[PDB]
Design a protein around this ligand. Structure first.
Ligand SMILES: [K+]
Ligand SMILES: [K+]
Ligand SMILES: [K+]
Ligand SMILES: [K+]
Ligand SMILES: [K+]
Ligand SMILES: [K+]
Lengths: 95, 95, 95, 95
């Protein structure tokens, strides 16, 4: 379950690195903005302060969303159930 | 389970084709933009770089979201559990 | 299960009517735009072509999201599992 | 189950207070706007009427989304199943 978490964590980082490199290069974003946009996209927040302007970028974004959402949300779920929840429970019981 | 996936895949493509034809025609979008907007809508990202301007388009969008989200997210789930997950597990074991 | 669906359907309509009346009145939207915005909000798409400008509207929106998401998505789930899925299965078997 | 709800409720309030203080201070938003933006972010609506402009804000937002979504949506789920659903059922049976 901690190895579950480690693998999803690594996969999430790799997925976000892919987006960061793509949007920096093809859409011309600063790397921090490309990382931020990748996160805002795959968590489905979608502010629209950044959005792709090239056709190559729009096509990549379609594919990135379909591949990336299941991973990101799997990580979020394991984070909440396997890390946040036990730490909250631990806080209720003084030692 | 691979036939589960094939059917959801076909249904997702058909749903995205419907949106592409509608928004190209009624909202005047280029086809690639109409496909991109359909994806951004049904995955609930919603950048707002494109949004419907006609009343016909707003009404269609209401109905398209309610019909389209359950399908799209069903496909994403099967993609992640039935295709991505086994391929990740396979990568852990050299042959 | 069809009464499950009927109740969620009615509750969803009532929730969308509430939003339509509120945003028309307080935020000055045309009724069709207020309905569209309510749907775009509770399904978490969030284009931002419309957004509340008054403090009363922002406060209402906070509460409307928290009360409305669980209902809307419950309806979507029952729609997909209890109506769309059987009709798809029925299409596979000629009579 | 009512203590389940109380704990998630308190945690959600604390998470929203954190965002309110951060975005007011670092991004210069009025407190009501910072609360509204925090809610719009963690429920994944993402209108984009407000979005972070500083790099410190973008980095905080990445981390806030990953930590905050699992909590917020856990609260929404318990709200819908443990509070809204029983009250709806109660309304069906006159006393
Ligand atoms: K969104
Ligand atoms: K969303
Ligand atoms: K969601
Ligand atoms: K926007
Ligand atoms: K959005
Ligand atoms: K937006």
């Amino acid at each position: 379950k901690d190895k579950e978490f480690q693998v999803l964590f690594v996969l999430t980082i790799l997925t976000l690195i892919s987006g960061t490199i793509f949007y920096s290069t093809v859409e011309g974003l600063r790397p921090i903005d490309a990382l931020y946009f990748s996160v805002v996209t795959l968590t489905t927040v979608g502010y629209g302060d950044f959005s792709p302007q090239t056709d190559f970028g729009k096509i990549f974004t379609i594919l990135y969303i379909f591949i990336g959402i299941g991973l990101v949300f799997g990580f979020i779920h394991k984070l909440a159930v396997n890390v946040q929840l036990p730490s909250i429970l631990s806080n209720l019981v003084p030692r």
